[PDB]
RNA sequence: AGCGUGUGCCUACCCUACGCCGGCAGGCGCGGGUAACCCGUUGAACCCCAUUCGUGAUGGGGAUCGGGGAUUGCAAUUAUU
RNA sequence: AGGAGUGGAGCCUGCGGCUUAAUUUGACCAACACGGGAAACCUCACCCGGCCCGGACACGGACAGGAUUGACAGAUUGAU
């Protein structure tokens, strides 16, 4: 819009999400992954991880 | 006799200009001045020094106790 | 969670009202159009918006930030 | 405006030509990178697609924080009508697969 | 290995694309029996292997449907032209098919039918096409507002140990 | 020419990978190119270690999950042609392969 | 400002020196005079719409009568070096809700706005509720 | 010593050798690393050997607190570090 | 049978109580360094001010000297 709609936030919380519902807090950056904790679970075994111990 | 000047109490005290050290009952007079003068101005210092409570970013609620009177 | 309150202020810019526009031009002599302020040629206008005479100001909705004269 | 007029018509055209248009759930997308730029302002693409949606003419899915709509025969009338362009085009179809 | 991502990354990327995919098909496929997907790149192709039980109803008028889903794929990832090709896949034997048998529950549920009798149905199919064993489980509401459950077992069932990765399949 | 030709080969899936090695050395065997034999790299892993609870209660617990990757790499000595020529031969399964210039 | 011998005279000159010359310095000489967090904000910062603070303080002090200071200036940034030509002013500042206002002093410089306007009523207790206590 | 980790990823960011300047925090100039290749033969701690202290709320303890300097950020006040 | 501790001191941190414009909220072996919850802004659910519509679609109405959009300067305003 005009001059005023949006605040920096490009480092800090609000400036990642995720890819699957877009939550924040409770998520995993490494690897370069972006996947919330409650559905990285959920996508586990697709391509990714498995357990073994 | 050139001991640095990183090396001593005060640098530039504040308001009188100059590298200072100071000893034994001129500290005290010196530091009595500082509290004074932040309740002069009065921020948020000198009503936490006139208050009895913690200058410095701590919590309050589970430190200092001493105490007693409960319910 | 819960509902507004109750302020009272509620109005709006102006709706931009419906009137009879453009008499930039005057009619005197056939077929003479007898601008009073200038048709304004600006590095973007194709002279065919006119520029407001404001009275104390000269001011273009197009040229809005710039080349607006205070007089 | 709401949004102009101009970009209605590089959207539906666009739309007519693949048969089909994607975009991400965003409210910040300049110019909506991947098809077209300088066109787009912000939401635009989505904006447009939820009413064209409301009166058929198009099904939509959803998945991962991306919309996915997928044009339809009477959408095919309505553009060719609306854009009143040639009979020539249809892209969603156009040969039997062997 | 530029621009391209390190090796350890390189797996990750590569089951991001296998997972979002996977969700984004069954979301519009699954009445048409859908029942996974195989991917594997080639040497300049892609091939996208769109395994379903009843092709029929995959092929659409005129090999339509196909041709939208190639055409959104080749946009969304935003490969060139000529790179991503779908191709469609008839797979025999569908007792077999968990997440088919599965989805096929779902529709008949859908349809307005009771709990015991869509079970059974589903579950003599596929002892039928050639199983050890089979299970159904329906949990939620149904005769009330206080849930339940309704197990409906045959055969032989595993539970524990490492053979579970091999002989059996779940949705 | 005959350029020092490295064919790194890495997967995830031991079996997968090692007889689509066994079969790039073959090839090249066959033709009698003085290859060498895979050098087996040290296998890495990637772990995530997470709570098994969405919303904390109940017992502290976590999971451990490990991928494991594995990299090895065969070295010829050869024409570039040929070389691309046994490369593409004979693979199927999820096996990834990189070519290489050329090698000191 | 109604001070004596707080930023001249006899008994206190602001680091070595008065009133006077800090209004005639820049930015540049003031900032070196010890006080390391202000030189911070100073080298990084140079103005982002300040501007709207800095100049109605200097008009307000202009225009309001002599021997009387000026109404208020307000703000919600409670974040703003004290300076010298800021001096004489009156400024309201916002907590969460209310405009505190507060007069500016010469020895107030080198804080920041926030210090003297608080957000909290001190406390005052007290008496233990009916589940405050293992019994 | 051992498990790891690292820019080329989201919308913008890494791990750091080496040279120089500074007591320190740190600044500055150059170079390598997509990684059994570069950082890193990760020359880590307790431990070990020789000085000093002497049973003393002591140099044990470092709470609290005064004054000053740096770095991150748009911003550090209730003191980010 | 034993080893090292906790309970005592100071601090960190969570919870109750109390205060407060608001001190957001779930949880009482199987809650209490737990919500991967080490909150400057952001997060943010809370409190106090101000702005925005991104109310599809349908039907009726308005309406081309016109439906409608935005804004220089001054006043006003934390606020350009």
């Given amino acids: 819009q005009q001059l005023y709609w949006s605040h920096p936030r490009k480092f800090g919380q609000g400036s990642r999400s995720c890819r699957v519902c877009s939550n924040r807090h409770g998520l995993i950056r490494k690897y370069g992954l972006n996947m919330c904790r409650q559905c990285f679970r959920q996508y586990a075994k697709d391509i990714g991880f498995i357990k073994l111990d | 006799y050139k001991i640095p000047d990183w090396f001593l109490n005060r640098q530039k005290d504040v308001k009188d200009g100059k590298y200072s050290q100071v000893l034994a009952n001129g500290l005290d007079n010196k530091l009595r001045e500082d509290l004074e003068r932040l309740k002069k101005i009065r921020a948020h210092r000198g009503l936490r020094h006139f208050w009895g409570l913690r200058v410095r970013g701590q919590h309050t609620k589970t430190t200092g106790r001493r105490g007693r009177t409960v319910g | 969670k819960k509902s507004y309150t109750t302020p009272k202020k509620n109005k709006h810019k102006r709706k931009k009202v419906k009137l009879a526009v453009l008499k930039y031009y005057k009619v005197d002599e056939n077929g003479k159009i007898s601008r009073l302020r200038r048709e304004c040629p600006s590095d973007e206008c194709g002279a065919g918006v006119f520029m407001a005479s404001h009275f104390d100001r000269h001011y273009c909705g197009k040229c809005c930030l710039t080349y607006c004269f205070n007089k | 405006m709401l949004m102009p007029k101009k970009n209605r018509i590089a959207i539906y055209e666009l739309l007519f030509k693949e048969g089909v248009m994607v975009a991400k759930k965003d409210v910040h997308m300049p110019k909506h990178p991947e098809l077209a730029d300088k066109n787009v302002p912000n939401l635009h693409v989505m904006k447009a697609m939820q009413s064209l949606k409301s009166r058929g003419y198009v099904k939509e899915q959803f998945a991962w924080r991306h919309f996915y709509w997928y044009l339809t025969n009477e959408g095919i009338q309505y553009l060719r009508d609306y854009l009143h362009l040639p009979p020539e085009i249809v892209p969603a179809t156009l040969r039997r697969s062997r | ?171 | 020419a005959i350029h020092r030709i490295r064919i790194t080969l890495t997967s995830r899936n031991v079996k997968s990978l090692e007889k689509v090695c066994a079969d790039l050395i073959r090839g090249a065997k066959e033709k009698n190119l003085k290859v060498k034999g895979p050098v087996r790299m040290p296998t890495k892993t990637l772990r995530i270690t997470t709570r098994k609870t969405p919303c904390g209660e109940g017992s502290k617990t976590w999971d451990r999950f490990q991928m494991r990757i594995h990299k090895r790499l065969i070295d010829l000595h050869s024409p570039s042609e040929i070389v691309k020529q046994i490369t593409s031969i004979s693979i199927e399964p999820g096996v990834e392969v990189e070519v290489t210039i050329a090698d000191a | 400002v109604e001070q004596k011998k707080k930023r001249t005279f006899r008994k206190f000159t602001y680091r070595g020196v008065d009133l006077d010359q800090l209004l005639d310095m820049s930015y540049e000489q003031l900032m070196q005079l010890y006080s390391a967090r202000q030189r911070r904000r100073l080298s990084r910062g140079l103005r982002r719409k300040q501007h709207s603070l800095l100049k109605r303080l200097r008009k307000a002090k202009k225009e309001a009568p002599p021997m009387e200071k000026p109404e208020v200036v307000k703000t919600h940034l409670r974040d703003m070096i004290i300076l010298p030509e800021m001096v004489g002013s009156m400024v309201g500042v916002y907590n969460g809700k209310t405009f505190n206002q507060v007069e500016i002093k010469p020895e107030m410089i080198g804080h920041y706005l926030g210090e003297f306007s608080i957000t909290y009523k001190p406390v005052k207790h007290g008496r233990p509720g009916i589940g405050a206590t293992h019994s």
């Fill in chain 5, 1 to 171: 290995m530029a621009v391209q991502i390190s090796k350890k990354r390189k797996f990750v990327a590569d089951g991001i694309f296998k997972a979002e995919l996977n969700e984004f098909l069954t979301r519009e496929l699954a009445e048409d029996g859908y029942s996974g997907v195989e991917v594997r790149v080639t040497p300049t192709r892609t091939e996208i292997i769109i395994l379903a039980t009843r092709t029929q109803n995959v092929l659409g008028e005129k090999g339509r449907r196909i041709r939208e889903l190639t055409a959104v794929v080749q946009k969304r990832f935003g490969f060139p032209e000529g790179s991503v090709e779908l191709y469609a896949e008839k797979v025999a034997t569908r007792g077999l098919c968990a997440i088919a048998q599965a989805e096929s529950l779902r529709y008949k549920l859908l349809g307005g039918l009771a709990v015991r009798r869509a079970c059974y149905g589903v579950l003599r199919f596929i002892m039928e096409s050639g199983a050890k064993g089979c299970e159904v489980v329906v949990s939620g509401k149904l005769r009330g507002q206080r849930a339940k459950s309704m197990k409906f077992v045959d055969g032989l069932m595993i539970h524990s140990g490492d053979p579970v990765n091999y002989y059996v399949d779940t949705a």
